[PDB]
Design a protein around this ligand. Structure first.
Ligand SMILES: CC(=O)N[C@@H]1[C@@H](O)[C@H](O[C@@H]2O[C@H](CO)[C@H](O)[C@H](O[C@]3(C(=O)O)C[C@H](O)[C@@H](NC(C)=O)[C@H]([C@H](O)[C@H](O)CO)O3)[C@H]2O)[C@@H](CO)O[C@H]1O
Ligand SMILES: CC(=O)N[C@@H]1[C@@H](O)[C@H](O[C@@H]2O[C@H](CO)[C@H](O)[C@H](O[C@]3(C(=O)O)C[C@H](O)[C@@H](NC(C)=O)[C@H]([C@H](O)[C@H](O)CO)O3)[C@H]2O)[C@@H](CO)O[C@H]1O
Ligand SMILES: CC(=O)N[C@@H]1[C@@H](O)[C@H](O[C@@H]2O[C@H](CO)[C@H](O)[C@H](O[C@]3(C(=O)O)C[C@H](O)[C@@H](NC(C)=O)[C@H]([C@H](O)[C@H](O)CO)O3)[C@H]2O)[C@@H](CO)O[C@H]1O
Ligand SMILES: *[C@@H]1O[C@H](CO)[C@@H](O[C@@H]2O[C@H](CO)[C@@H](O)[C@H](O)[C@H]2NC(C)=O)[C@H](O)[C@H]1NC(C)=O
Ligand SMILES: *[C@@H]1O[C@H](CO)[C@@H](O)[C@H](O)[C@H]1NC(C)=O
Ligand SMILES: *[C@@H]1O[C@H](CO)[C@@H](O)[C@H](O)[C@H]1NC(C)=O
Ligand SMILES: *[C@@H]1O[C@H](CO)[C@@H](O)[C@H](O)[C@H]1NC(C)=O
Ligand SMILES: *[C@@H]1O[C@H](CO)[C@@H](O)[C@H](O)[C@H]1NC(C)=O
Ligand SMILES: *[C@@H]1O[C@H](CO)[C@@H](O)[C@H](O)[C@H]1NC(C)=O
Ligand SMILES: *[C@@H]1O[C@H](CO)[C@@H](O)[C@H](O)[C@H]1NC(C)=O
Ligand SMILES: *[C@@H]1O[C@H](CO)[C@@H](O)[C@H](O)[C@H]1NC(C)=O
Ligand SMILES: *[C@@H]1O[C@H](CO)[C@@H](O)[C@H](O)[C@H]1NC(C)=O
Ligand SMILES: *[C@@H]1O[C@H](CO)[C@@H](O)[C@H](O)[C@H]1NC(C)=O
Ligand SMILES: *[C@@H]1O[C@H](CO)[C@@H](O)[C@H](O)[C@H]1NC(C)=O
Ligand SMILES: *[C@H]1O[C@H](CO)[C@@H](O)[C@H](O)[C@H]1NC(C)=O
Lengths: 170, 316, 317, 169, 171, 315
C-alpha cells in the first residue's frame, strides 16, 4: 500500500501466473502471452529469505530450573521467581507481537516497491514510444511483434529503432 | 498494441497482522510460535542418568534407593516424582540450593576423607535403611559411644581439600527420640557440634524429644552441607549426636537437570525440556510451557503469530 | 492555459513529536501515550471488597479482638491499612510476608474445626492483652495449660487430617514465658519441646522463657508458625507445654487481589490498577504515576510524556 | 519527507482546507475552487486508526505485591526485588520511547506517501493533456470548465476527448 | 534498495566525488564537469546525525551490586540473581541486534530515497526539454552551455526559454 | 546530457540489515563498547578505598578499621583483603548489612549514652592488638565483677532522637567452654533479648569446644537492626553480651564497588567493575555483565555496526 502499485493502480493479481511473483502479459498482432520476470521475483524472494534466516534463529543460551515442581520452594522466594518469570513473559510477548507486525508491514511494502520498480524500468525503457494508460499497462504506439515483446522483457528493446513511427502516431 | 506487467495471487490466502491493519491477506505466511510438544525426553547423544526411585540429594548420603548412583556421570540428569532423599526420617537443611548445585554437577566423584576413630563405635545402624538387615547411609558413619550410657569423647576430625576443585562436604545431626535415648547413645550432658572452615562457622545442638514415628523411628537425622575450597580445611568438633561423612564429593564437570514425567528416548534430539517432554523447534517463540529449561524458544502468551512470506494477496 | 493543483492540509499551531531521525518535528495532531492522571480513591465498583482497617491481615487467621468481624470473610479485593495489627498479646508471625502473600490472593477464608478435644489439662487460658469484656484470648486458638500451678503437663499428641479437596492453612503458637519459673508454673518443671510434622514438614520448637520488657503489660511472647496441609495429608502436634493450639483450620475460598492503601473506597468508579494512593484508570500503554502499582496496569515508564503522531507533518507559510 | 511530497516539492499545506487531509484546488475560466479528496483521506486516517487500535491496548496480565509498604521485607530480598523492578523499568522505558519514535517516523512517511500517490494517479489520468510544473500543479493545455474539473476529481476525465487541442502545444 | 536508485537504475557511484554524497556530472560543448549537490547531501547527513543523537545516548540509571564477588552470597538467592541477570542479557542482546538491523535497513533506504528525490526534481525542472535515458541521465535536446548547467544545479533553468528549439529537436 | 549520481569508496564496511547480512555501506560506527580502563576513575568523587578494612568493620571497629570509624564517601571500594573481624566471629545477615553500608554516603557515629554499675566494662583480647590486648573500638565487652560472680539482670535502652534511621549493633559471645562461660558471667542459663517496634528476637549463647582461630576458641557474633526515628531499642541480658557504645547514622548517598585495580583521580566514569571503569557513550557493552553504576546495557555480541552512510557501490 506504501508504493501504490499492488492493490493500487494495478487492479489485481494474476492467479494464472504460476511461475513467478512479477510478470508481463501482452497483446499484439500475433497473439496474447504471459511470462514471468525472474530478476525482480528473485529479488523479493531473496529479501524474504533474508528475514527468515534472521528470525528462525536459535538462542544458544542455557537456562536452569530455579524452581521445583515436585516439592515447592519456600513461598517467599517462590513468589519472587514467579513475579520475575511473569515479568519476562510480558516483555517477550510484547516483543514477539511487535517484531511480527513490523516485519509484515515491511514485507508487504517491500513487495509493493518491487512491482513499482519493475514498472518504472519498463516505462524508462520505452522512452517516448508508449504511454501510461494508468492500470499498469503500456499502450504501444507502433506495431510490435512477438520478438519485439521478448526484447522488452530481457531488456534490449532499442527505442530510436521505432521512434519516428510512434512519435508520428502521437 | 499493449504490454502490461502484474503480480501473482491465489484464491485463498492467509491473514496476518501489520502495524496498520488486522487480518490483511497475504499470499503465503509462516508460524513463529511453537505449539507442538514431543511427549518424551529426547536424550540422543547425551550421557543420561534417570534417577527414578533415587532422590538427587540421596546420591550424596546414600540410602539404599541410591546405591547405584553414588558415583555417576551425566550431561542430563532426570529427577522423578517418586525420588526420595532419605531412608531414616529426616531432612536436608537448605535442600533446594544443594539440588541446584547437584543438577549442574556433571555428576559426582567420591573420595575418602580418611577419618579413623578410636575408643568409640562406628557401626551404628537402623532397620530404616534396609539392606539385608539394618544398614545405614552408605557414605556416612553413625558415631556412637562404646557402651550404653558411657561418655562420648570430645573429638576433632579435620579434612583438607587437596584437590584442584571445590569439595562438597556433608554431615548429620542426630535428634534422638528422648532425652534418655540421647544419654544412652552418647552419654549424659549437654551436647554440641561445631563445623568451621575459612568461609564457614556454625554450631549445632541436638533436640532430643518425643516425635511421631516415621518408618518406625522417632529420631531424626538432619543433613547439613558446605562447599570446601581448594586447599581449605574443614574441622569437625563434637561429643555425640554426630553422623560423620566417610567420603567427600567432587563435581565432575557440567550437566543440566530436569524434572520429568515422561519416558526417555535416545532417538530424538532436543535441548529444551519440561516435565511433559521436549520442545523440538527452530521457531523463535513457544506457547507450550513457561517453565521449560535448556536452550529454548522464548515463551509467549500468544498461541499463534504469523509472519508474512509473500505479497499483499489480491484476487480477481 | 489553466491549472489544477493538489495539496494537503495544515494548521497554524501543531504539536511536537519525536521520530527516528529528528527531535521536535511538528505534526498536525498527536496523542499521549503515558498516563499521568491518578484517581485518589480505591475504585472498587463491582468487586467484593474487604477493607481490613484496624485488623491486620494475619489477624484474620488467629483472631485478636480487632479482627473478630473478619474471621470468615469473602473478597475479590482486600485492602490492608497502615493501622492494621496482627496481634493482641505481644508476639510475631514467623515468616510473615509469605503468609500475607498467600492470604492476599485467598479470595477470602473459610474456617473449619480441627476437632481437637482435651483431657486432664486446662484449655481456657486468657490474658488482659486480648480485651473482650475481661481477659479473653485469640478467638481461633486455645492456650493449653497444666491443671494446677506447677503440675506436670502431659506428653500429648493431637493429629489432624485435611479431608477436604483443597489445601489447608494450619497455625499454632509457641509461648515464651517471662521467666523460667513463669514457665514451670504454667506447664510444670523440665525441658519442654514441641514438634510438628506432616509429609512435607518436619520441625521442632523450644520455648525461650526469660526476661523481656513488657509490651501491653506482658513479658511473655507468643509466636505463630504455619504450614499448608495438602489434601489427604495429616498434621501431628506433639508437645508437653508452651503450646497455643489451633481450634480451626483455614481454607482459602478462591481468588482475590490484595493491596495496601491510604485512600477511601469508591464503589462508583471502576479500575484494575491500584497503588497506595489510588487507582490508575486508563487505556494507555504506559504510566508514570507509580512504579509499584499492582493489578492489570499500564507498564510503568521513566518518561513523563511520549507523544504519538496522529496526523501528517504540518507545514504553514 | 521519505517520498518528497509533503514539505518536498509541494511548498506547503492549506490551512483553509477544513474538510479533509488531501484535496484539489483549481483555477480556470469560470473561477477558483477548493474541494477535498475523500478516498485518500479515508485511507490515511484508516491506517492511523489501525495503529491506535494496536497501541491503546489493555494488557490482561495481573501482577501482585511481592513487596510491602507498611512493614519492609527483609532487606536482602528487598534489594533483589528492587533491582529487578528497576531492571524492568529500564526495558519498558527503552521500549516505549522506541516504539513511539518508530511509529511516528512511519506515520509521517505514510502521509507523505499518500499525497504522492494522489499526485501520480492524476498525472496518469491526464496522460498527455497536461504538464508537471513541479510544485504539485498540472498546467492544463486546453480550456477546461468546472464540469471538466469535477470529472478529474471523481476519476472520469476522458483524455482523448480533448487530446488534439492540447497536443498542438 | 527500496526506491530503486542506488544499486538500481543508477549503475554505481562515483569514487571521484569527494565533496558530497549526491551530485551532478555533465557533458556539453565546452567540456565535462563534476560538482556536488549540497541540499540533498545535508538532508541525508542531517537524518543520520539525528539517529546517532538518539542512540549514542546515556542512561541516567544507577544500579548497585546485589551480588558479591569476594564472599559468595547464599547459593539459592545467588541462583535467582543469576537467572534474572541472564534473563536481562537475553532481552538486551535481542533488543540491540534488532534496533541495529532495523536502523540500518532504514538508513540505507533513507539514502536511496534522497537520490531518487534529487533525480525527480531535476526531471520536473526540465519539463519537456530532455529525456530519461534510464541510467540516471538526462539527454538534453538542445545545445546547453556551462552557465546553462549551473542554472539547472542551483534551480533556475527556465524551460520555455529553449523550449521551442528542444521540442522540434525531439520531433 | 546532464547526469546525477552518488558517492562511493573502494573499501566500505559490512553491516547487517533486516533483509541481508554483510551488506557494504560507505561509513559505519560501533555500538558495543569493548574498551576497558584498568583503573578506578575516581575524579571528582569523594573516595574511600577500604584496603585492609572490611566494610562491616567500620561499624564495630577492629584495628584494621580505626581510620574508618567515621568516613564520608560518594564512592566506596572494598578490597579482596578486607576483613570485618579481629576476634573470630561472623556478622549474621552480613550481605544485607554490606548493601546498606555501600550506599550510606559514609557513616556518622553517636554515643548511645549507656553507663554501667556493678560490672566490668573493659574486657579485652589479644586478638584485637593495639599495643596490648584491646577490643572492638565501638563495643564494650560486659563482664561480671569477679570470676564466677553472678552477672545482674540488666536493661539498657536507647531512643533514636535524630531525624534519620539509626544503625544499631550488638554481639553475643560464645565462650569456649561451659565453664569459660560461667567463669565470665556466673553460673546459670543465659539469655539476651532485643526489642523495638519492628524488632523482636532473643539469643542464647552456645558455649562449648571449637578450634582456635587467632588463638581463641570463643566466638563473638554480631547482630543488627535499623532503628526508626523516635523508636527505642531495649537490651535485656544477664551476660554473654557485647554492648554497643555508639550508634551509626548514614550520611547521604554513595555507591560501593569491589575492585582489584588502582584508583585514578584523573579519569572520569560512572560505570565500574572489579577490573576497572567502562568509559563510553555507546548504548551497549561487552566487557562485564556485572558492571555497576550508570552503564551501557550489557550484551552478548562483541560488535554491532550501525550504518552511517549509504549503500556503497564501487566501480
Ligand atoms: C517401650 C518398649 O519397650 N518398646 C520396645 C523396644 O524395646 C523395641 O523398639 C526399639 O525402640 C528403640 C528406641 O526406643 C529403637 O527405635 C529400636 O530401633 C533401632 C533402629 O532400627 O533404629 C535399632 C537400631 O539398631 C538403633 N541404633 C542405635 C541405637 O544406634 C536405633 C536407634 O537407637 C534409634 O533409631 C535412635 O533414635 O533404634 C527399636 O527396635 C522393640 C523390641 O526391641 O519393641 C518395642 O515395643
Ligand atoms: C512481682 C509482682 O508481685 N507482680 C504483681 C503480679 O502479681 C501481678 O501482675 C501479673 O504478672 C503476671 C506475670 O508475673 C502476669 O503478667 C499477669 O497477667 C496475666 C495476663 O493477663 O496475661 C494474667 C493471665 O491470667 C495469665 N494467663 C495465664 C497464666 O494463662 C497471664 C500469663 O501468665 C502470662 O501472660 C504468661 O506470660 O498473666 C499479671 O497480672 C499484678 C497483680 O496480680 O501486680 C503485679 O505488681
Ligand atoms: C590449659 C591451660 O592452662 N592453658 C593456658 C591458659 O590458661 C592460658 O591461655 C588462655 O586461655 C584462655 C582460655 O582458656 C583464653 O584463650 C586466653 O586468652 C584471652 C584473650 O586474649 O581473649 C585473655 C583475655 O583477657 C580474656 N578476656 C576476657 C575473659 O574477658 C579472653 C576470654 O576469656 C576468651 O577469649 C573468651 O573465650 O581470653 C588465653 O591467654 C595461658 C596461661 O595464661 O597459657 C595456656 O597454656
Ligand atoms: C561394631 O564395632 C564395635 C566396636 O569396635 C564392636 O564392639 C566390640 O567391642 C568388644 C570389646 O568390648 C570387642 O571384643 C569386639 O571385638 C567388638 N565387637 C565385635 C563383633 O568384634 C561391636 O560389637 C560391633 N557391632 C556390630 C553389630 O558389628
Ligand atoms: C508459581 O508458579 C506456578 C504458576 O506459573 C504455580 O504452579 C506455582 O504454584 C506458583 N508458586 C507460588 C509460590 O505461588
Ligand atoms: C510458504 O512458506 C514456507 C515457509 O517459508 C515456505 O517453506 C514455502 O516454500 C512457502 N510455500 C510456497 C508454496 O511457496
Ligand atoms: C595453599 O594454601 C596454603 C595455606 O594453607 C598456602 O600456604 C600454600 O601456598 C597452598 N598450598 C598448595 C599445595 O596449594
Ligand atoms: C486528535 O487526536 C485524538 C486521538 O486520536 C483524536 O481522538 C481526535 O479526533 C484528533 N483531533 C482531531 C481534530 O482530529
Ligand atoms: C477453666 O477450666 C478449668 C478446668 O476444666 C475449670 O476448672 C475452671 O473453672 C475454668 N476457668 C474459668 C475462668 O472458667
Ligand atoms: C485420599 O486418600 C484416601 C484414602 O484413605 C481416599 O479415601 C480419598 O478419597 C483420597 N482423596 C483424594 C482427593 O484423592
Ligand atoms: C525499594 O524501592 C522503593 C521505591 O521504589 C523504596 O521505597 C524501598 O525503600 C526500597 N527498598 C529497599 C530495601 O531499598
Ligand atoms: C553466578 O554468576 C557468576 C558469574 O556470572 C558466578 O561466578 C557465580 O558463582 C554464580 N553464582 C552462583 C550462586 O552460582
Ligand atoms: C564515520 O562515522 C563516524 C560516526 O558517525 C563519524 O564520526 C565519522 O565522521 C565518519 N567517518 C568518515 C570518514 O566519514
Ligand atoms: C577494669 O575495670 C575494673 C572494674 O571496674 C578495674 O578494677 C580494673 O582494674 C580494670 N582493668 C584494667 C586492666 O584496667
Ligand atoms: C516523635 O514522638 C516523640 C514522643 O516521645 C516526640 O518526643 C518526638 O519529638 C517525635 N519526633 C518526631 C520526629 O516527630
Amino acid at each position: 500500500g506504501l508504493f501504490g502499485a499492488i492493490a493500487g493502480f494495478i487492479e489485481n493479481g494474476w492467479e494464472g501466473l504460476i511461475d513467478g511473483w512479477y510478470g508481463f502479459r501482452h497483446q499484439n498482432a500475433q497473439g496474447e502471452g504471459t511470462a514471468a520476470d525472474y530478476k525482480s521475483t528473485q529479488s523479493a524472494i531473496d529479501q524474504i529469505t533474508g528475514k527468515l534466516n534472521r528470525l528462525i534463529e536459535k538462542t544458544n543460551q542455557q537456562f536452569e530450573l530455579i524452581d521445583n515442581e515436585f516439592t515447592e520452594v519456600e513461598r517467599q522466594i517462590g513468589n519472587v521467581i514467579n513475579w520475575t518469570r511473569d515479568s519476562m513473559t510480558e516483555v517477550w510477548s510484547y516483543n514477539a507481537e511487535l517484531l511480527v507486525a513490523m516485519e509484515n508491514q515491511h514485507t508487504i511494502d517491500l513487495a509493493d516497491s518491487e512491482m513499482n520498480k519493475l514498472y518504472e524500468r519498463v516505462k524508462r525503457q520505452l522512452r517516448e514510444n508508449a504511454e501510461e494508460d494508468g492500470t499498469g499497462c503500456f499502450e504501444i504506439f507502433h506495431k510490435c511483434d512477438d520478438d519485439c515483446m521478448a526484447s522488452i522483457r530481457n531488456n534490449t528493446y532499442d527505442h530510436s529503432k521505432y521512434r519516428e513511427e510512434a512519435i508520428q502516431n502521437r | 498494441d499493449k504490454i502490461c506487467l502484474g503480480h501473482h495471487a491465489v484464491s485463498n490466502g492467509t491473514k496476518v497482522n501489520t502495524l496498520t491493519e488486522r487480518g490483511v491477506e497475504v499470499v503465503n505466511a509462516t508460524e513463529t510460535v511453537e505449539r507442538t510438544n514431543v511427549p518424551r525426553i529426547c536424550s540422543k547423544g547425551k550421557r543420561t542418568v534417570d534417577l527414578g526411585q533415587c532422590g538427587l540429594l540421596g546420591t550424596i548420603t546414600g540410602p539404599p534407593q541410591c546405591d547405584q548412583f553414588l558415583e555417576f556421570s551425566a550431561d542430563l540428569i532426570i529427577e522423578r516424582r517418586e525420588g526420595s532423599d532419605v531412608c531414616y526420617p529426616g531432612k536436608f537443611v537448605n535442600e533446594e540450593a544443594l539440588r541446584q548445585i547437584l543438577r549442574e554437577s556433571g555428576g559426582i566423584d567420591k573420595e575418602t576423607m580418611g577419618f579413623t576413630y578410636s575408643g568409640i563405635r562406628t557401626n551404628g545402624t537402623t532397620s530404616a535403611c534396609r539392606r539385608s538387615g539394618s544398614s545405614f547411609y552408605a557414605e556416612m558413619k553413625w558415631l556412637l559411644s562404646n557402651t550404653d550410657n558411657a561418655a562420648f569423647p570430645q573429638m576433632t576430625k579435620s579434612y583438607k581439600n587437596t584437590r584442584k576443585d571445590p569439595a562438597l562436604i556433608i554431615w548429620g545431626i542426630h535428634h534422638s527420640g528422648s532425652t534418655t535415648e540421647q544419654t544412652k547413645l552418647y552419654g549424659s550432658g549437654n551436647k554440641l557440634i561445631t563445623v568451621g572452615s575459612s568461609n564457614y562457622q556454625q554450631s549445632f545442638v541436638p533436640s532430643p524429644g518425643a516425635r511421631p514415628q516415621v518408618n518406625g523411628q522417632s529420631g531424626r537425622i538432619d543433613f547439613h552441607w558446605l562447599i570446601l575450597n581448594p586447599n581449605d580445611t574443614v574441622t569437625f568438633s563434637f561429643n555425640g549426636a554426630f553422623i560423620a561423612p566417610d567420603r567427600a564429593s567432587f563435581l565432575r564437570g557440567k550437566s543440566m537437570g530436569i524434572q520429568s514425567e515422561v519416558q526417555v528416548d535416545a532417538n530424538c534430539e532436543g535441548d529444551c525440556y519440561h516435565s511433559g517432554g521436549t520442545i523440538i523447534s527452530n521457531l523463535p517463540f513457544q506457547n507450550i510451557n513457561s517453565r521449560a529449561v535448556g536452550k529454548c524458544p522464548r515463551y509467549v502468551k500468544q498461541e499463534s503469530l504469523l509472519l508474512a512470506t509473500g505479497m499483499k494477496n489480491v484476487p480477481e
